[PDB]
Amino acid sequence: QVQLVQSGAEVVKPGASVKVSCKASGYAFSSSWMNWVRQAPGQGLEWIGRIYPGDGDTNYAQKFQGKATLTADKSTSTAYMELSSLRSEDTAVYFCAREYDEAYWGQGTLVTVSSASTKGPSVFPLAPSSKSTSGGTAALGCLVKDYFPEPVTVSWNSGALTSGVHTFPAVLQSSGLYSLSSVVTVPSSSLGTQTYICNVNHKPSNTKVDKKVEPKSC
Amino acid sequence: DIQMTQTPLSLSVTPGQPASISCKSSQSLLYSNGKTYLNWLLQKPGQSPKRLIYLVSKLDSGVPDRFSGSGSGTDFTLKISRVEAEDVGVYYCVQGTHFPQTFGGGTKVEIKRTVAAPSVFIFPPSDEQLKSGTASVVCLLNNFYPREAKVQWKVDNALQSGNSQESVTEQDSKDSTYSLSSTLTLSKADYEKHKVYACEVTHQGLSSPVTKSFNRGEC
């Protein structure tokens, strides 16, 4: 069926430009409009423009008239979007959507405009103990600390463990770095035989970490 | 810019009950052609949008029946006959009749459920974090409702302030509950100057406050 996979999140220094890709698959890439929408953190969406891969016809909204340039590559069924003269206000999630009315959307790409240095996270286990085991169930998780910029992805046992998982929105520390936790609730009776591992992915820095979480005497 | 006004901005409903949202533009979204281009999008927290209703009334492949689209002129409205847990998220209406395309501010739909007290868990610092010189103590409030919850940190029975950060999740799409985490972060030196670390929880679903604690030693 119809798919739209976008490139991963990245950091860009103010004044610079960035190119976001959007791979299409499952339909006639050339005979259908491709939109680019912007999501301002916490405040609505903004249409940016479209492109008809067929004849390469493009439309832009006054705002991004000269700040964005849209292109497409039929041989790859990929739509690209370049953004120039990036400012701090340009930090947002950018999506691509198929058809003139956005019938299908990509997962989106968070672009952070900042002169701050990129930094991969530290991953510390939140170990299960009598202090984290309620009536028959135990809670355990991972502390993903000190990373920049957002986002960071968390999965348990390579995606096999998703039931009862909570991954909290990140908090901003004084240091200007981010921090968050991911927890899971399982049977306390299984801590002796089941294995739990959090998979932490921070694309902006091509960083991947796996931490084994074992019980602790407490 | 045709201006898209959405209302209400927030809306909590109880499971099954009906819900309605409104969207009023600033000019007929009716094209010279016999069609009006106005859609409704649903956006789960942190997820990508999903078109629910296009062309004002036509639904969309794989979409519940309780979702109906109507209205016209410049007064369109979405309607959910039987709102359900799964319906949580932000709804938006988009106009594609003029130029450029514009969206409404969105409407956050929340589910009102029965009070549910949180389960409280506490986690001591990992030995590896201590090596780095810092120490994070985490207190977890799991699957509770309503959202309002008061958590406080006490070290050796001395109330704390200015050393913790908390974060609350989106409303669960299955049980409609929330979870919250409070993290006390202090230096290794300071973590070593004290013995007892306790988390105190106060929530409408608890007859009496709840305290989870541990001794730095025995742990």
Side-chain angles (χ1 to χ4, degrees):
Chain A
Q1 36 57 291
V2 56
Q3 284 286 304
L4 296 176
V5 176
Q6 312 188 202
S7 51
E10 51 194 299
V11 214
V12 290
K13 290 182 185 306
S17 69
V18 58
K19 174 178 272 57
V20 175
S21 63
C22 167
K23 292 154 163 286
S25 68
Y27 77 93
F29 177 69
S30 306
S31 61
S32 182
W33 286 103
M34 187 61 106
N35 293 287
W36 289 86
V37 179
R38 171 209 259 189
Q39 173 148 61
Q43 61 170 190
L45 299 148
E46 284 194 302
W47 182 72
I48 289 171
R50 14 130 76 160
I51 187 173
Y52 199 80
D55 61 309
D57 186 40
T58 63
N59 292 296
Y60 297 109
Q62 301 186 65
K63 288 195 64 180
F64 327 83
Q65 192 57 274
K67 198 175 71 58
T69 77
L70 310 183
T71 66
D73 190 302
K74 308 173 190 178
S75 64
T76 65
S77 297
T78 304
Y80 298 85
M81 178 196 183
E82 192 224 302
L83 283 177
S84 302
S85 295
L86 282 172
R87 201 173 301 173
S88 281
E89 303 110 67
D90 296 306
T91 291
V93 171
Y94 298 80
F95 302 90
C96 55
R98 160 174 149 58
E99 286 183 49
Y100 74 94
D101 56 50
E102 287 80 52
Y104 305 107
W105 300 66
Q107 77 274 46
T109 303
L110 168 57
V111 178
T112 302
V113 184
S114 164
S115 66
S117 181
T118 290
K119 180 173 187 180
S122 298
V123 185
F124 304 118
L126 292 171
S129 76
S130 57
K131 295 295 161 52
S132 75
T133 68
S134 190
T137 95
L140 57 83
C142 282
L143 180 62
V144 185
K145 190 180 189 296
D146 304 317
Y147 62 94
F148 186 77
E150 287 201 61
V152 73
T153 270
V154 194
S155 65
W156 286 82
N157 294 343
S158 302
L161 181 46
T162 65
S163 176
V165 166
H166 293 312
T167 293
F168 295 88
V171 290
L172 172 69
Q173 290 163 303
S174 283
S175 66
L177 271 27
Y178 293 99
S179 181
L180 69 73
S181 278
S182 188
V183 301
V184 190
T185 45
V186 301
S188 52
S189 72
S190 74
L191 304 172
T193 58
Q194 302 320 110
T195 282
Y196 299 110
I197 300 171
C198 61
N199 317 120
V200 177
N201 186 56
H202 190 227
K203 282 180 183 169
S205 63
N206 301 317
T207 298
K208 281 165 177 299
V209 180
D210 295 275
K211 182 60 75 301
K212 200 178 185 297
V213 185
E214 63 188 60
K216 185 177 184 175
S217 302
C218 189
Chain B
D1 303 56
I2 202 63
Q3 181 59 54
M4 235 51 236
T5 296
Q6 194 147 177
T7 173
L9 301 188
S10 185
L11 160 58
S12 63
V13 189
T14 63
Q17 195 167 59
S20 289
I21 307 174
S22 294
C23 263
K24 303 179 181 181
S25 62
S26 301
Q27 184 156 51
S28 173
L29 304 189
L30 169 56
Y31 200 46
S32 61
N33 155 56
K35 297 177 178 177
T36 60
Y37 302 81
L38 180 142
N39 314 296
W40 288 91
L41 303 170
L42 180 275
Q43 171 167 45
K44 285 293 194 305
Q47 295 183 55
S48 68
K50 292 184 184 186
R51 189 181 64 173
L52 291 176
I53 297 168
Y54 60 101
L55 290 180
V56 183
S57 61
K58 287 183 62 184
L59 213 71
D60 228 330
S61 181
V63 174
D65 306 6
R66 46 173 189 294
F67 283 115
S68 64
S70 62
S72 190
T74 71
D75 305 300
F76 306 66
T77 62
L78 175 65
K79 187 180 179 182
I80 308 174
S81 52
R82 289 141 293 175
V83 177
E84 301 194 306
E86 291 321 318
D87 303 333
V88 186
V90 181
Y91 294 80
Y92 306 81
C93 62
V94 199
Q95 158 283 304
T97 301
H98 298 54
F99 197 86
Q101 274 186 182
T102 46
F103 311 70
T107 294
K108 181 195 284 193
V109 163
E110 317 175 307
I111 272 52
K112 275 192 290 187
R113 62 158 283 164
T114 58
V115 174
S119 297
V120 181
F121 303 109
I122 196 160
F123 298 102
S126 74
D127 294 306
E128 28 199 304
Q129 173 175 39
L130 293 174
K131 274 186 175 183
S132 75
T134 174
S136 289
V137 191
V138 182
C139 186
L140 172 73
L141 275 59
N142 209 42
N143 307 325
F144 66 83
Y145 187 85
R147 190 171 51 196
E148 300 61 36
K150 188 178 182 180
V151 48
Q152 295 183 77
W153 288 95
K154 281 183 173 184
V155 174
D156 295 314
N157 198 193
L159 228 170
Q160 296 292 298
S161 69
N163 268 158
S164 53
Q165 296 190 277
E166 63 177 37
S167 177
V168 61
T169 60
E170 338 75 64
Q171 172 153 45
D172 196 71
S173 298
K174 293 178 177 178
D175 51 38
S176 308
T177 66
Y178 294 90
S179 290
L180 173 166
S181 65
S182 177
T183 307
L184 175 62
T185 291
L186 40 78
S187 70
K188 175 181 177 182
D190 183 58
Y191 180 63
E192 297 291 48
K193 184 173 178 179
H194 302 77
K195 178 72 174 182
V196 168
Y197 291 79
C199 182
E200 180 178 301
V201 180
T202 287
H203 172 85
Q204 177 183 169
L206 295 178
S207 62
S208 284
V210 173
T211 303
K212 260 290 199 295
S213 70
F214 70 85
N215 292 73
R216 188 197 59 201
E218 182 234 63
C219 185

